[PDB]
Design a protein around this ligand. Structure first.
Ligand SMILES: O[C@@H]1[C@@H](O)[C@@H](O)CO[C@H]1O
Length: 305
């Protein structure tokens, strides 16, 4: 019957895999087929929409590889009589202002960022680190709003908790992955020999993991590193290791909700001109660590070690 697209920027992330999985579920529930496409860059994005059209899809959910493609995506879709819903990453105009008109479903970025900071500080306190010889490494992707609001949130929280502002070092990453974050963290590490203990701030699991990997390379032991990721699902391989690392835990969101709900809303729209709410913010979050990850996953229905 009805065909709907589910386009994601990073198909390799468990986050996005989970959104795909739950979109499938909505498909089975509501009676539509989900066409799952990877759109890692702008070219593939625009091409992919062309393909959808050839397939006779009525609309698509998208997590764009670039928010600035917003205009183009919308123009293309319009042309094809396709309805669009954005997941995770909000469309912006040329000027960098949000395209409010496109329905969006995303995490409560600021709130989750702030929770990251809170939990970083809590764990620091637990370990009894001397603030004097501690520092925050904030690996940023400021060109992406969602990423920005997380890392700002985190930094704000740390500062509010009384972590010295002067000891917070930001470094931009060129890619939102391990390799990117690794590179960034490495360059910051060598700049600060004075630091004995690091808090690692990053918008997601991969970013923080990259940070952790770099610290290990610069001869830091797990005890001296705290990195708390965001996503949860992305962190499972890390949390499953025999030995504890600098990667302490992750804030598990609801990619299940994002996948299912975005899909379901698109369907209602396409099938019944049921106009989605412009903004859907998902506030779920739980801290998963080495101790509780398996419970919490299975509790949330994302089972399997
Ligand atoms: O890239 C991130 C992804 O890892 C998840 O955190 C959702 O938001 C996207 O911007």
């Amino acid at each position: 019957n009805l065909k709907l697209g589910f386009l994601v920027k990073q198909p390799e992330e468990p986050w996005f895999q989970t959104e795909w999985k739950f979109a499938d579920k909505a498909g089975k529930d509501l009676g539509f087929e989900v066409i799952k496409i990877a759109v890692p860059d702008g070219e593939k994005t625009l091409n992919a929409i062309d393909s959808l059209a050839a397939s006779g899809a009525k609309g698509f959910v998208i997590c764009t590889p670039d928010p600035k493609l917003g205009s183009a995506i919308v123009a293309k879709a319009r042309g094809y009589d396709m309805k669009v819903i954005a997941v995770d990453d909000q469309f912006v105009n040329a000027k960098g202002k949000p395209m409010d008109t496109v329905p969006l479903v995303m995490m409560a970025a600021t709130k989750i960022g702030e929770r990251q900071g809170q939990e970083l500080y809590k764990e620091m306190q637990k370990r009894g680190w001397d603030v004097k010889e501690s520092a925050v490494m904030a690996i940023t992707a400021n060109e992406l709003d969602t990423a920005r609001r997380r890392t700002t949130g985190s930094m704000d929280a740390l500062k509010a908790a009384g972590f010295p502002e002067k000891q917070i070092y930001q470094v931009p990453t060129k890619s939102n992955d391990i390799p990117g974050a690794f590179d960034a963290a490495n360059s910051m590490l060598v700049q600060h020999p004075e630091v004995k203990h690091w808090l690692i701030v990053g918008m997601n699991d991969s970013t923080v993991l990259g940070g952790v990997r770099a610290t290990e390379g610069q001869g830091f032991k797990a005890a001296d590193i705290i990195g708390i990721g965001i996503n949860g699902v992305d962190a499972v391989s890390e949390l499953s290791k025999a030995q504890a690392t600098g990667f302490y835990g992750s804030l598990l969101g609801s990619p299940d909700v994002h996948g299912y709900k975005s899909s379901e809303m698109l369907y209602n729209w396409v099938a019944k001109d049921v106009e989605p709410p412009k903004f859907t913010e998902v506030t779920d979050v739980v801290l998963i660590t080495r101790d509780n990850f398996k419970e919490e996953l299975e509790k949330k229905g994302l089972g399997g070690k």
